Design a protein that fits this description.
By secondary structure, the protein is α+β, with helices and mostly antiparallel strands. It has 9 helices and 9 strands. Helix 4 packs antiparallel against helix 6 and helix 6 runs antiparallel to helix 8. The relative contact order is 0.11. Bound molecules: the ligand CN1CCC[C@@H]1CCn1cc(C2=C(c3c[nH]c4ccccc34)C(=O)NC2=O)c2ccccc21. The site of the ligand CN1CCC[C@@H]1CCn1cc(C2=C(c3c[nH]c4ccccc34)C(=O)NC2=O)c2ccccc21 has 18 residues, from strand 1 and strand 3. It is found in: Cytoplasm; Nucleus; Cell membrane; Cell junction, Focal adhesion. It is an enzyme of class 2 (transferase).
């Protein structure tokens, strides 16, 4: 392998963003000119807050992925105080940004981006991995305007780490609120919310606070605005179903075939999405 990288191998630049346990900073590797988004984690804080399982899962899960719709973990290293993860730098930011910028998507853009998310989830669930925090904030856009999903510390790798995390309120599935249990279904729920959000401009469950959002979720209290692309409404209704075993994409619903075969995706070529030019605003 290459020599372990070190802080002194890079010129660190702008902070991209800041979380409770990490900071992502853009970094230029002196020896190659390459730019990376390096996620930097203070070891003390991770230890104090019992987060080693999560930091260990993020590295381990990202290390196992090898597909263009995910952020790549290129390297890791550490000094006495911090850990460093060398990630892809997605130049065009998060999908959330793009949703806020251009407002709601026309059907062509909705379809294209929905198809890349479905195709990514198919890859992920095939490896027996659940994301658990799928939302537009963590679906990045690369330079060529294809998706790159990130944020895997909170993921779950399935059996043959059970039910401790709950993602962003607006995307939380009913089964997380009623059971102590994450399943592939929960990602498919979040997918339904994301499709609704691309079309509508806002997510389907909204209120003043998290308690009120959760009450709406368990009662399935949401509505479609009037011009909502009909086949997309049909797809969303087949995902935002309280019975987790009855969501399109689930093993009990015969898998990703039926989901990919929905009318909404009739014009999609599923075989080489990453090779296709994305529609442009
Ligand atoms: C986690 N943050 C919440 C708000 C901004 C950021 C978005 C989620 N996110 C982007 C990440 C990444 C990138 C970011 C790209 N723009 C960002 C802005 C703030 C924070 C991170 C990024 C990137 O270029 N490559 C990434 O993996 C990222 C990496 C690990 C865990 C979460 C990550």
């Amino acid at each position: 392998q290459p020599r372990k990288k070190r802080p002194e191998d890079f010129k660190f630049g702008k902070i991209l963003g800041e979380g409770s346990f990490s900071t992502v900073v853009l970094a230029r590797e002196l020896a190659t000119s390459r730019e990376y988004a390096i996620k930097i984690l203070e070891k003390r804080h991770i230890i104090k807050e019992n987060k080693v399982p999560y930091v260990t899962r993020e590295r381990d899960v990202m290390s196992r992925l090898d597909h263009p719709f995910f952020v790549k973990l290129y390297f890791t290293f550490q000094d006495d105080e911090k850990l460093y993860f060398g990630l892809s730098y997605a130049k065009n930011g998060e999908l959330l940004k793009y949703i806020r910028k251009i407002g709601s998507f026309d059907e062509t853009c909705t379809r294209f981006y929905t198809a890349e998310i479905v195709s990514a989830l198919e890859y992920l669930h095939g490896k027996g991995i659940i994301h658990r925090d799928l939302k537009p904030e963590n679906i990045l856009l690369n330079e060529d305007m294809h998706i790159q999903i990130t944020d895997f510390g909170t993921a779950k790798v399935l059996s043959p780490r059970a039910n401790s995390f709950v993602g962003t309120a607006q995307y939380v599935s009913p089964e997380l609120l009623t059971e102590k249990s994450a399943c592939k279904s929960s990602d498919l729920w979040a997918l339904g919310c994301i499709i609704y959000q691309l079309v509508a401009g806002l997510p389907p469950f909204r209120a003043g606070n998290e308690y009120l959002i959760f009450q709406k979720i368990i009662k399935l209290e949401y509505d479609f605005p009037e011009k909502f692309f009909p086949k997309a409404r049909d797809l969303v209704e087949k995902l935002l179903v309280l019975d987790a075993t009855k969501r399109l994409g689930c093993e009990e619903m015969e898998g990703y075939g039926p989901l990919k075969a929905h009318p909404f995706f009739e014009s999609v070529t599923w075989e080489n999405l990453h090779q296709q030019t994305p529609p442009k605003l």
